Design a protein around this ligand. Structure first.
Ligand code: 75C
Length: 1042
C-alpha cells in the first residue's frame, strides 16, 4: 500500500549489500528484579505489539520498487517463557540463548518473522526479558516506547482496569508527511543546501589507517562506556558559561578526533532523531537521519570559537534535516558500496530508558544497536556538570585497550582547558606522560665516530689484507693491493685532466670491474661521482651534465658520440687497467666533501640532484658493518644500477670489511634466471632486492632451484617499497637465508631505519607489511602532526628524519632545499628532512610505513613524481591539460609485486583529436623510459569532484580491446607469442601489433614471459628483449633472426 520512507530506504539498500545474518536487527533485554506475573506479562506483550502498527509491516519486491503495507490480519505470538532457573548453573546460559537468537538468518528475505520476544529467568527474584526487532520497523527512540507501553498495559491489568489505549500514531501519516514534503518547495531548498555542503565538505577520515568499508560491517561492536569523575569538565563549563555545555563537549570531541585522524579538516556524522515537530513523534517506525558535518579545526581559534561555529552549522543543518542522507548519496556520483561521506559519527541521544513497575527494579542492557562501519561517539554532559561518553567501534578496525588510552587523552584535553580556558586549539597536546619519554630512548642512537673518509676506510683495510680477493667480474680479479694500485693510478690520471677536490665527475660506464674502480678513484681524488644511466635519452643527460657542471665525464669509446653535443665537457675513456705506481693513499678527500650526487625525479618538470656528504655515507656504512658484519669470507653482489643510491653500499661496504665484490653482467639485475646463475657461479653471500624484484625472483624458484643457487646467501637486504610479510615468509621457506627490511629516501644516506624480516621477528608481524623499524646510528625519526606536535603511538603522522645522515641538499636548488630541509623545532639550530611518508609508531617502538602525503610514487621501487610527467606532457603541442595516473590496467597481470603502469590523460587545447602515438614517441626524447606512460588517452574534459578537484576514481581505464585491429599474427613465432601473451594477460590476442605493456603487462610479467618463450623455443629470449620489442610482431623478428 505504501512506499518505504525516512530511514527505511537507506536501511534497505544497506542490508541488500550486507553479507551477515542479522546486521540490521536491534535487540536488547531488560533485567527485571522481583516477583513478576509472567503469564500476564506474556499476555501484555501481545496486546502491546498490536498497538505498534509498524510491527505488522510486510514488504514485497515490486520489480525493483519496494513497497510496504500493514497486515491487519496478522496475529501475534504469545512469548515463550523459559524455565531456565533451577537448571543449568550459569545464568549465562540465558545470555547464550539470547546471543544464539541473533546468529539466525533474520534478514527480511529469510521469511522469518521480524519481531521476537521471550521471558527468561525463570523466577530467581530476577528476570531477563528479551526483545529484537528488524531495524526497518523501529528507531532507537520507538522500541523503548514500545516496551514502556507493554509495561503500562501490564501494570494497568494488575490494577483491574481495561487495557490502555494505544499511544501510537499510524506510521502512514509519516508517509504522507514526506510524500507531501518530497512534493514541496522545501525539498528543492534542502537539495540545494546539501549540494553546497557536498562541494564544501572535507574528505572522510578515520583513526584506523585502513580504508572505510561501505558494506557488510559487523553489528557486533565494541561498546565502551566511560564516566569522567575528575570534574575538570565542571570547572571548564563554569569558567566559560557562554557555551551551551553540549556545544563544549562537541568541540572537545572534535579536537580529540582530529588529533587521532591526523586531520584538521574532516567529515564526521551527526545523528538527528527527527521526532519533535513531526507526525513521527508518536509513530513507531524508524525516522532517523545521520548527516554529514564538516569539521574544520583552526589552529588560531580558542575553544569557545570552535563550539560557536560548530553550533552555527548544526543549527543550519537542523533546518534541513528532513532531506534523507540517502538522497545526498545518489545526488553525488557515488552509489552502492561506494566510499562513505564521513567516518566517525557523533551523537547526544541517551544510552538507556527507564520503567516504573511498582516494587520492581528494571535495567535495560543493549545487545545490537545496528552496525558501525567505523567509530561512533556519544556525548552526555549532564546539568550537574559531570561528563560521560560511549564509544561504539568496528571490531575489525579497533580494539578496547587502545580506545581506552585515546579516551584518557580526551580527559587530558579537558584537564588542560580546565587549567587554561584561553588556550588555543593549536597549543594542545595529547601525549600521555611517559609516552614522550619512550620515544626519547628510541631516538637515542648517538654513537661517536671519528672523522674519516671512504678513501681512508678503504685504504686502511687494504693495509690489513693485501692478498685477499677484492674485486672480480667475468674477465678480471684484483687483490686489495692490486685494487688500490689501479685506484691510485686512475685517480692520478684524473688529476692530470683537471679533477680537483670539490669537483664532480660524471660516470657513464657499463657494469664491469672498471665501474667500481672509477668510483673509488674519484673519491680518492677528493671529487664526488655522478652516475649516468646511459638508458636515459640524450636530452636528459644533457640536463644533468649542464646542471652539475662536472669537471670530467668517464665513459666508454662508443658512448661519447651521444655527448658530442655538450659544450665544454672533458671526457676520459676507461675500459682497461693502467700501469701500476704503488698503492699509497693520496689523502685528498675530507669529511666535509660531497661524496656523490644522485639525481631523482622532481615535481617541477626537471630532475634534481641530491648531494651526499662524505661523513653521512661513512656513518651509513660503519653502521651496517656493526649491525650486519662482513668477514671477507663474504662475497657481495654488485647488482644494483649505479644510478640508484642502493648501489653505493655495494660499491664501498665490502672494501671496509675485507670482503670480495663481484660484478653481475649487464641487464642481469632484471632477469631472475640470470641472478640464479650469477649467485651460484660466484658464491654470493650478500645482496639486495627491491620487494617487487624479490617477488619476481621468488616466482622464479622452486625448493630445488632455491637450494642450488641461494645456498650461499647469508644476508639479503630489501628496501625501496613496502615489504609484505607473506613475501618474506615465502622467502624464508625457500632459503632460510636471513632477510632484512631497510627504509630511506635518497636525501638521507641510503637507509635510516632497519627491521628484521625473518625468524621470530617476522612471525610476530600481524600486519600486511614489515615495519620499516628503528633508526640507524646518529639518526632520529620524528612523526609529527600537521601542527608539528609529536603524535602518540598508533596515530598516523608525517615522517621527518634527523641526524648526520642528512644530505647536503639539492644541487643548485636552494629553494627546494629550504622547502624540505626545515628547522627541527625539537633541536634548535638543527635541520630535519620532510620525507613525504606517512607513518605510525607500533607498540614495540618500530615504525610502520603507511603511504605518501604527496604525488610521489614508487613504481617497482623506482621513484617518480607524477608532477614531473604532468608538466612535460603539458609542454607538448596542443596539450592544454595533462594528468598522469598510476593504475593496474589488467587484473590478470597482478601476479604479485607492484603491477601499476603509468597512464597519461590529455585534453587538447584546440579540441581536435591528438596523435597520441606520436606524442608518446616525443615523450621518449625527454623522459627516462620507465617514466613514459604506456598509454595516452585523450578526454573531452577532466573529471571533477563536487569541490572542483580532479576525480582520479572517475578516470577511465584503457580498454583491452583495441578499436583499430591490425594484421592477424602470421604462422610461426607470431602465433606462439600471441598465445603466450594471452596466457599471462588473460584475454585472447589475435593482433600482431598488440602491445604487451599497453595490455597491462609490466617488467615483472615480462620476466615470466621470457622464461616461457625460452622454453617454447630452443633459443633464449631475454626479458630485456621484451622491453625493446614491446609488440608481437617486433618480438618475433628478434627471435626469427638468422
Ligand atoms: P620494470 O623495467 O617497470 O621493473 C624492473 C625492475 C624491478 C628490475 C626495476 O623496477 C628496477 O630495477 N628497480 C629497482 C628500484 C630501486 O633499486 N630503486 C632505488 C631504491 S630506493 C632509494 C630511495 S628513493 O628515494 O628512491 N625512494 C625512497 C622512498 O621509497 C619508499 N621506501 C623506501 N624504502 C621503504 C620501505 N622499506 N618501506 C616502505 N617504503 C619505502 C619511501 O616512500 C621513501 O621515501 C633507497 N634509499 C631505498 O633504499
Amino acid at each position: 500500500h505504501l512506499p518505504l520512507v525516512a530511514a527505511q530506504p537507506g536501511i534497505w539498500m544497506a542490508e541488500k549489500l550486507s553479507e551477515l545474518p542479522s546486521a540490521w536487527s536491534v535487540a536488547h533485554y531488560v533485567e527485571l528484579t522481583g516477583e513478576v506475573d509472567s503469564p500476564l506479562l506474556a499476555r501484555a506483550v501481545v496486546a502491546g505489539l498490536a498497538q505498534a502498527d509498524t510491527l505488522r509491516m510486510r514488504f514485497t519486491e515490486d520489480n525493483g520498487e519496494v513497497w510496504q503495507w500493514v497486515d491487519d490480519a496478522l496475529t501475534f505470538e504469545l512469548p515463550e517463557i523459559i524455565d531456565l532457573r533451577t537448571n543449568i548453573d550459569p545464568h549465562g546460559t540465558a545470555q547464550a540463548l539470547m546471543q544464539a537468537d541473533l546468529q539466525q538468518d533474520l534478514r527480511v528475505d529469510s521469511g522469518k518473522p521480524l519481531v521476537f520476544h521471550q521471558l527468561i529467568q525463570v523466577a530467581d527474584n530476577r528476570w531477563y526479558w528479551y526483545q529484537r526487532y528488524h531495524h526497518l520497523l523501529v528507531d532507537g527512540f520507538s522500541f523503548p516506547a514500545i516496551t514502556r507501553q507493554i509495561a503500562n498495559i501490564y501494570c494497568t491489568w494488575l490494577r483491574g482496569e481495561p487495557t490502555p489505549a494505544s499511544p501510537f500514531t499510524p506510521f502512514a501519516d509519516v508517509v504522507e508527511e514526506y510524500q507531501q514534503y518530497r512534493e514541496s518547495e522545501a525539498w528543492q531548498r534542502d537539495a540545494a543546501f546539501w549540494a553546497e555542503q557536498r562541494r564544501q565538505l572535507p574528505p572522510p577520515a578515520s583513526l584506523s589507517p585502513a580504508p572505510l568499508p561501505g558494506r557488510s560491517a559487523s553489528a557486533d561492536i565494541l561498546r565502551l562506556k566511560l564516566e569522567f569523575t575528575d570534574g575538570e569538565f565542571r570547572q571548564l563549563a563554569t569558567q566559560l558559561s557562554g557555551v551551551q555545555r553540549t556545544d563544549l563537549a562537541l568541540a572537545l570531541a572534535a579536537l580529540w578526533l582530529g588529533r587521532l585522524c591526523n586531520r584538521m579538516d574532516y567529515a564526521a556524522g551527526f545523528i538527528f532523531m527527527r521526532r519533535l515537530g513531526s507526525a513521527a513523534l508518536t509513530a513507531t517506525g524508524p525516522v532517523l537521519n545521520v548527516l554529514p558535518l564538516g569539521i574544520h579545526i583552526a589552529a588560531q581559534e580558542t575553544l569557545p570559537e570552535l563550539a560557536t561555529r560548530l553550533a552555527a552549522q548544526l543549527k543550519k543543518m537542523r533546518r534541513h534535516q528532513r532531506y534523507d542522507a540517502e538522497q545526498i548519496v545518489r545526488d553525488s556520483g557515488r552509489a552502492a558500496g561506494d566510499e562513505p561521506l564521513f567516518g566517525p559519527v557523533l551523537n547526544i541521544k541517551v544510552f538507556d530508558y527507564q520503567l516504573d513497575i511498582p516494587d520492581v527494579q528494571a535495567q535495560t542492557h543493549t545487545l545490537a544497536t545496528g552496525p558501525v562501519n567505523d567509530l561512533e561517539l556519544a556525548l552526555f554532559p549532564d546539568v550537574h556538570g559531570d561528563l560521560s561518553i560511549e564509544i561504539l567501534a568496528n571490531k575489525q578496525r579497533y580494539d578496547e585497550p587502545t580506545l581506552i588510552q585515546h579516551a584518557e587523552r580526551l580527559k587530558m584535553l579537558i584537564a588542560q582547558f580546565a587549567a587554561d580556558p584561553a588556550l588555543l586549539c593549536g597549543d594542545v597536546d595529547i601525549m600521555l606522560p611517559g609516552e614522550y619519554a619512550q620515544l626519547a630512548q628510541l631516538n637515542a642512537t648517538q654513537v661517536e665516530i671519528p672523522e674519516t673518509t671512504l678513501s681512508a676506510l678503504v685504504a686502511e683495510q687494504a693495509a690489513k689484507t693485501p692478498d685477499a680477493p677484492a674485486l672480480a667480474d667475468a674477465r678480471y680479479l684484483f687483490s686489495y693491493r692490486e685494487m688500490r694500485e689501479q685506484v691510485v693510478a686512475l685517480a692520478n690520471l684524473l688529476r692530470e685532466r683537471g679533477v680537483k677536490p670539490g669537483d664532480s665527475v660524471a660516470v657513464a660506464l657499463p657494469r664491469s670491474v672498471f665501474l667500481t674502480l672509477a668510483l673509488h678513484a674519484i673519491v680518492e681524488a677528493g671529487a664526488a661521482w655522478l652516475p649516468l644511466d646511459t638508458g636515459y635519452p640524450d636530452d636528459r643527460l644533457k640536463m644533468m651534465l649542464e646542471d652539475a657542471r662536472p669537471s670530467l665525464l668517464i665513459t666508454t669509446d662508443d658512448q661519447l658520440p651521444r655527448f658530442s653535443d655538450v659544450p665544454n665537457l672533458t671526457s676520459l675513456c676507461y675500459n682497461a687497467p693502467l700501469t701500476p705506481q704503488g698503492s699509497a693513499p693520496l689523502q685528498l678527500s675530507q669529511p666535509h666533501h660531497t661524496a656523490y650526487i644522485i639525481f631523482t625525479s622532481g615535481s617541477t618538470g626537471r630532475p634534481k640532484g641530491v648531494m651526499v656528504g662524505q661523513t653521512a655515507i661513512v656513518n651509513r656504512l660503519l653502521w651496517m658493518q656493526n649491525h650486519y658484519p662482513l668477514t671477507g669470507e663474504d662475497v657481495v653482489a654488485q647488482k644494483t644500477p649505479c644510478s640508484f643510491d642502493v648501489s653505493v653500499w655495494e660499491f664501498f661496504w665490502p672494501f671496509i670489511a675485507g670482503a670480495k665484490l663481484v660484478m653481475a653482467e649487464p641487464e642481469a639485475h632484471r632477469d631472475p634466471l640470470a641472478m640464479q646463475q650469477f649467485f651460484a657461479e660466484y658464491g654470493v653471500t650478500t645482496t639486495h632486492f627491491v620487494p617487487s624484484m624479490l617477488a619476481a625472483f621468488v616466482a622464479s624458484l622452486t625448493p630445488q632451484t632455491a637450494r642450488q643457487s641461494c645456498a650461499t646467501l647469508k644476508q639479503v637486504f630489501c628496501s625501496g617499497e613496502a615489504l609484505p610479510a607473506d613475501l618474506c615468509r615465502e622467502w624464508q621457506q625457500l632459503t632460510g637465508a636471513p632477510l632484512h627490511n631497510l627504509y630511506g629516501p635518497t636525501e638521507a644516506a641510503v637507509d635510516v631505519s632497519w627491521y628484521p624480516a625473518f625468524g621470530e621477528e617476522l612471525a610476530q608481524v600481524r600486519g600486511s607489511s614489515v615495519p620499516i623499524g628503528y633508526p640507524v646510528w646518529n639518526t632520529g625519526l620524528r612523526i609529527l602532526d600537521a601542527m608539528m606536535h609529536p603524535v602518540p603511538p598508533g596515530v598516523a603522522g608525517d615522517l621527518y628524519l634527523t641526524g648526520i645522515q642528512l644530505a647536503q641538499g639539492y644541487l643548485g636548488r636552494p629553494d627546494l632545499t629550504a622547502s624540505r630541509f626545515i628547522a627541527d623545532p625539537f633541536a634548535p639550530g638543527e635541520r630535519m628532512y620532510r620525507t613525504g611518508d606517512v607513518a605510525r609508531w607500533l607498540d614495540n617502538g618500530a615504525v610502520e610505513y603507511l603511504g605518501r602525503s604527496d604525488d610521489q610514487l614508487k613504481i617497482r621501487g623506482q621513484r617518480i613524481e607524477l608532477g614531473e610527467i604532468d608538466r612535460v606532457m603539458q609542454a607538448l603541442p596542443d596539450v592544454e591539460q595533462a594528468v598522469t595516473h598510476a593504475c593496474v590496467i589488467n587484473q590478470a597481470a597482478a601476479t604479485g609485486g607492484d603491477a601499476r603502469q603509468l597512464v597519461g590523460y590529455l585534453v587538447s587545447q584546440s579540441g581536435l583529436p591528438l596523435d597520441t602515438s606520436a606524442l608518446q614517441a616525443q615523450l621518449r626524447e625527454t623522459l627516462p623510459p620507465h617514466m613514459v606512460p604506456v598509454v595516452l588517452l585523450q578526454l573531452p574534459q577532466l573529471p571533477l569532484s563536487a569541490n572542483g578537484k580532479l576525480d582520479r576514481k572517475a578516470l577511465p581505464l584503457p580498454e583491452l580491446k583495441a578499436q583499430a585491429p591490425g594484421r592477424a599474427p602470421k604462422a610461426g613465432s607470431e602465433t606462439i607469442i600471441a598465445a603466450a601473451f594471452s596466457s599471462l594477460l588473460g584475454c585472447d590476442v589475435q593482433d600482431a601489433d598488440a602491445d604487451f605493456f599497453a595490455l597491462g603487462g609490466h617488467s615483472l610479467l615480462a620476466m615470466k614471459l621470457a622464461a616461457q618463450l625460452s622454453r617454447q623455443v630452443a633459443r633464449q629470449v631475454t626479458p630485456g628483449q621484451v622491453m625493446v620489442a614491446s609488440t608481437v610482431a617486433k618480438l618475433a623478428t628478434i627471435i626469427d633472426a638468422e
